[PDB]
């Protein structure tokens, strides 16, 4: 019984991701998040070892083993008209969209640390066979005391494959020009495009493109003072041709990415 194993608290938010409540695991008082998803609103389905669950549950189980920069699925339940997902909640926490809104454009030292952690989390997903397909500031939680970033909201994701994708339900302003123009993309190179959008967002205070014509136009205007090394990495991630984009290895070996702060240093300098 779900209702007796958890004490439900205030609604945290609702949207394309469902309705998410704060919560407490009654057994050990562990802080949790309780996500409800109506069955009628679930487009992709999958199967675990043997049970017909939302694809989101399939993907979360593949990435939730061991420690990583992904919010871990602790449990799930099936209800007559919905699935309920129990997720580990850091406290205190703030999502990266609210963080950038309040702080403005981030110092490059802080964006380097954040962007590095996001890269490691995406690499972990891909190593687990999981393509997230909705990387953006809204889908990244910051553990303010530990200085650690966590990916959330796999409801637009897919199993990772090397063949072309012709479906997409992530966030359009982070989607690549080959999706806009052709409704085709490949997993890794599309992820790198969204990472370029995310990095620009971090160092400029907002995303570079709002309209389809800007996305496919491939001109990056910098509205804030940004170092030449960082501008180069961003424009590389945002190459119009997918095969001109860097691999994850090339991103992490880029000169702008060197000498990253540790998570605890990041909290003590920038978050505490």
């Amino acid at each position: 019984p779900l209702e007796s194993q958890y004490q439900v608290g205030p609604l945290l938010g609702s949207g394309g991701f469902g309705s998410v409540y704060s919560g407490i695991r009654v057994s050990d008082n562990l802080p949790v998040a309780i996500k409800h998803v109506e069955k009628d609103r679930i487009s992709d389905w999958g199967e675990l070892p043997n049970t017909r669950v939302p694809m989101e549950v399939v993907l979360l189980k593949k990435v939730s083993s061991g420690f990583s920069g992904v919010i871990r699925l602790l449990d799930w339940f099936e209800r007559p008209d919905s699935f309920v997902l129990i997720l580990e909640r850091p406290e205190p926490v703030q999502d990266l969209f609210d963080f950038i809104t309040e702080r403005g454009a981030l110092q490059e030292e802080l964006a380097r640390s954040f962007f590095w952690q996001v890269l490691e989390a995406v690499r972990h997903c891909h190593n687990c066979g999981v393509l997230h397909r909705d990387i953006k500031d809204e889908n990244i939680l910051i553990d303010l005391n530990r200085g650690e970033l966590k990916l959330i909201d796999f409801g637009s994701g897919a199993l990772l494959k090397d063949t072309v994708y012709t479906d997409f339900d992530g966030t359009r302003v982070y989607s690549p020009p080959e999706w806009i123009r052709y409704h085709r993309y490949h997993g890794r190179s599309a992820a790198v495009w969204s990472l370029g959008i995310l990095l620009y967002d971090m160092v400029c205070g907002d995303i570079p493109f709002e309209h389809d014509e800007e996305i496919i136009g491939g001109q990056v205007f910098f509205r804030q003072r940004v170092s030449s090394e960082c501008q180069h990495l961003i424009r590389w991630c945002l190459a119009l041709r997918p095969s001109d984009r860097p691999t994850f290895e090339e991103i992490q070996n880029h000169p702008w990415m060197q000498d990253v702060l540790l998570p605890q240093e990041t909290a003590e300098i920038h978050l505490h």
């Binding site: 969209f97 809104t101 982070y174």
Partner: peptide, 8 residues
Amino acid sequence: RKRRRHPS
């Protein structure tokens, strides 16, 4: 200049 969330 307005900054906004975007649904998915």
